[PDB]
Symmetry: D2
Subunit: 262 residues, 4 copies
Amino acid sequence: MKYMITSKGDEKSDLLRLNMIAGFGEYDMEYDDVEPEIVISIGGDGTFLSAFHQYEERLDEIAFIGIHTGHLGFYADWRPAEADKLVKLLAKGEYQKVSYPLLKTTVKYGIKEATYLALNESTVKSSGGPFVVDVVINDIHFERFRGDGLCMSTPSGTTAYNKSLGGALMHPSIEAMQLTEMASINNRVYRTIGSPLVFPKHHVVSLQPVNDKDFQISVDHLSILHRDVQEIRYEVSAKKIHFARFRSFPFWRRVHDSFIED
Amino acid sequence: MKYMITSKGDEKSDLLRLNMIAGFGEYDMEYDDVEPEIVISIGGDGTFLSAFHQYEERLDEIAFIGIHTGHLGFYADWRPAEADKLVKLLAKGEYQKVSYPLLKTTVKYGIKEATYLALNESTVKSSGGPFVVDVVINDIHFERFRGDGLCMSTPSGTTAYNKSLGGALMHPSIEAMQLTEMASINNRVYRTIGSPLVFPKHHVVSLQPVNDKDFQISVDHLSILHRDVQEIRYEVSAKKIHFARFRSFPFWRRVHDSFIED
Amino acid sequence: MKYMITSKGDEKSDLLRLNMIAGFGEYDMEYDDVEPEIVISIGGDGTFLSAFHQYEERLDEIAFIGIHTGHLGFYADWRPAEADKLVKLLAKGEYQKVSYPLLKTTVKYGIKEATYLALNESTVKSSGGPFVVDVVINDIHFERFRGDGLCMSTPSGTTAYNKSLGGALMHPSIEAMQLTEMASINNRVYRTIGSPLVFPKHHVVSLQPVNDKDFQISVDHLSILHRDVQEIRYEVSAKKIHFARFRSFPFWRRVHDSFIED
Amino acid sequence: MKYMITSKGDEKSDLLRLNMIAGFGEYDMEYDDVEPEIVISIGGDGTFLSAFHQYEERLDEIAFIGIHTGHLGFYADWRPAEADKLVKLLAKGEYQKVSYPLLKTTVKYGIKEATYLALNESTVKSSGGPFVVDVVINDIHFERFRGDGLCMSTPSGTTAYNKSLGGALMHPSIEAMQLTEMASINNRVYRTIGSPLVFPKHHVVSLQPVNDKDFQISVDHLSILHRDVQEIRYEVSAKKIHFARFRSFPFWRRVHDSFIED
Ligand SMILES: NCCCN(CC#Cc1nc2c(N)ncnc2n1[C@@H]1O[C@H](CO)[C@@H](O)[C@H]1O)C[C@H]1O[C@@H](n2cnc3c(N)ncnc32)[C@H](O)[C@@H]1O
Ligand SMILES: NCCCN(CC#Cc1nc2c(N)ncnc2n1[C@@H]1O[C@H](CO)[C@@H](O)[C@H]1O)C[C@H]1O[C@@H](n2cnc3c(N)ncnc32)[C@H](O)[C@@H]1O
Ligand SMILES: NCCCN(CC#Cc1nc2c(N)ncnc2n1[C@@H]1O[C@H](CO)[C@@H](O)[C@H]1O)C[C@H]1O[C@@H](n2cnc3c(N)ncnc32)[C@H](O)[C@@H]1O
Ligand SMILES: NCCCN(CC#Cc1nc2c(N)ncnc2n1[C@@H]1O[C@H](CO)[C@@H](O)[C@H]1O)C[C@H]1O[C@@H](n2cnc3c(N)ncnc32)[C@H](O)[C@@H]1O
């Protein structure tokens, strides 16, 4: 099939990429970075996030694979020594595909909307002043949040920023998104839930400005300052990222290997 | 239909129960506490947990309703002033039913198994000495836990003990269970994940003894000391508790009303 | 004595200030906002923080008083109805003074040092990229911190940002400072202590850059972007803020009244 | 001087103890386990806690030393390979002594008081039912605690149970004690501070029963069920444990070595 390979751009990843391209030249595999059906990312989870967003308009026609040239990644979960074995099995095909849920972010602004997809999370912080937003769940006012910010995570993202904020780790077969707080003010006057919140599909979480309407909005590794924002809306996307799998590497073992020992 | 009413047993709940029985006597509703199809609990969430376990063998043929004579409950979410309006709508029927997932707990012991269902959670603590268990997820060793104990929660239970342990709040339409730690030891020698873990249906979490094999095992409000325990196993039950609903009272508003303000 | 009054600048605070000035005109009290010996702040804790920094060069010759025209403050802990009783007792003098410890922040930058005093806390965040600093305690490398940032709090500051980050509340008679993390990355590769750390007088905590050397540094309500920073150093100051007291309002009751109920 | 040696009682510790006794026989050092002036503990922190409580009536006349035959301990902070070098320097004397603060626990019960000293912490849990106590600080009611229990820690104890409960780590030169919660219930009806609280010397924290008056009270490794308890009182002790030091091993390096890497 058509395939492309993206590289972190250090010497190890570049030369692994060139060696895999050579191995692919021995099969019926065309290098096409415009309409690939296989996207291989060589580097770390950061590289893999860039690959994802590089091809987010063709998610339904692409199976991703990540190779980690440094430590193990949750996405880049293949070792560089297995790259040849990877070339062959990928060339033959007949591989299974697994899908992880994604987070849809809608930003309504000015006197119009922008939509984004996140593989890890979307966060909202302030443009410097205090951060105050009303949190509305399915059109009912839930809380008035004052603090540093809010993080809305996919399942595969729960091991990332969400984790460092005290969120739960969620198996990626659960179609959900998780909201976590960053340093909420809680006293007699100001009140938030504190706990992470886990939302199923079709639930809509809306953040609405109270005073300042300029926010720093992040989607995975991208961080945009948005002006005249009237609303930020979160829901589980109907779109899914597809991974090529050649071997059982269970999520919970990936968790164990990354945080417990390996 | 056949119905029964359980009471917290204070004066307010007893007399509300007697008044509802009188109102039911004006319809084709038989009082039957052996095979009821409607179980009304009058009191607090504790009373409702007892009603649930009182009839856990007939969960598929019963719709539960909770009336709170004190503060609002997450199960006992009807006000005593609406009890007459409750009698009538229940008598006419045609009400919708909602189902919440349950937690199955299997205790394998001695030289044989006991199974329990939990509406809130099942927890494991030690018989006094140190608590050390191996946590095995789908037959793979995940961590060696040393600390006070572990809590495995249903979705509707996430607002209970789970919450106080830092777990996430999960919408009850998600078929899952959540594992939280109680005071884990973490140093250079001992290592746990720390984060809550959320498991989908068909995942099996197994706790296995390391030294001492006597544990205090709780299921909702019941706490049993178990001896010669070889294993404790958690999975989402195939069984579900059914609630009668007459009006939209969304879960997240119940959360708001219980923890944010009302 | 010489006195001045600072106002939040809303109608309630401005007119309370004018009424207290009139009451002071009935005694031997001169209004002097250049060398006051009494500084009254009327507003909220924010106003009081500004008063403190307005006169931080004359801390040894000033006793501060805060009046809260909104909710109770931890500094602005006098009610507007007691303002007349305040004028009289202040005019007579013979009041006791209480002192709270302060935090000294030294910023060494470029190819030279700036020093600041904090009543609540000093924090360090990144100029947008990832935040990575080496934490050095009394010249020994303690940890390599990667995450959102770090907060170093005084005792009276522990009820502020420090609290929202999970720090301990410390009685202000303890001469100490407390370091808390903001969303640290912890995995097999990256490791921080996680817990808040409480340092006595004469201990020096030094933050040192690893890659990027531009940081957002805050001191109480002031937030400065610092460039070519080589080091950030924290220690308990030898200087102390002095409060005028006329009545026992214990710290722990102030805590109770602000967070538990009032 | 007079000295004694306590052993964990495994083969490594017993034979190290016998070898040190032989080395001591080459100096003017008498083995006396009744009135020693030097108490050497060989084992882990558990062994050292037992040594402390074995001689808690002669704390002012004893300097303790801990040797760790397993992993590094916070008390047993000497390696077994340095045991000979230890014998000699101890024999010559002229060593410095360092003191750590202790926690005094007073239990008033029945229709009379018992007092205990803790090197790590004293905790209070329930005899099985729900745990509900009123927390009174310096005779003012601070909160009504409902949950699993409460932990009151010394400074050197903050790296132990306190840490696992989210308490701050405190340098042992600070004369203080720290109160942490175990799984507090927090909703609209029930309210605790949540944060750890750090108390200076002369502050008195009193726990008072609300319904049940049977509590499980722990002091370091000892756990006693107390009946007809009317009050539990915590304050910093006027007594201090004395360590013999022969070399700088700073507290914060001990923390680093135990939790960060070694
Ligand atoms: N250097 C390039 C920039 C990194 N960048 C690609 C990443 C990543 C990433 N994804 C995951 C994952 N799904 N499960 C577990 N591990 C993951 N990683 C690790 O995260 C560490 C730091 O990137 C590294 O080990 C990665 O291996 C953006 C992501 O930074 C996260 N992020 C931001 N601020 C954070 C904070 N304060 N605490 C924790 N994570 C934070 C957030 O989540 C973004 O999306
Ligand atoms: N008095 C009779 C015994 C109470 N008993 C019926 C209960 C309950 C209950 N269920 C829920 C719920 N699903 N969502 C939110 N609220 C709930 N409640 C409240 O919990 C408070 C204390 O029962 C009360 O307000 C209830 O309203 C057993 C449950 O105690 C919980 N439990 C035990 N130890 C806990 C701790 N340390 N922290 C927090 N919860 C704890 C655990 O979870 C059991 O199952
Ligand atoms: N509106 C003017 C700007 C506020 N500003 C004067 C303040 C303050 C303040 N001091 C204290 C205190 N010692 N004990 C308890 N209460 C305190 N207050 C309250 O804090 C709330 C929000 O100011 C209000 O109720 C105040 O009453 C700067 C302080 O924002 C704190 N701060 C910043 N970011 C925070 C976060 N994410 N979470 C918690 N606190 C945060 C930080 O600490 C600064 O220094
Ligand atoms: N095996 C004999 C029994 C252990 N026993 C001697 C101990 C100890 C101890 N003291 C310290 C210390 N000051 N700084 C750091 N490390 C310490 N240790 C370690 O603690 C681990 C487990 O003892 C081991 O590595 C020790 O090395 C009693 C102490 O268990 C603590 N304790 C109890 N329950 C706990 C929990 N849930 N989480 C955390 N600690 C807990 C509590 O604190 C007692 O007092």
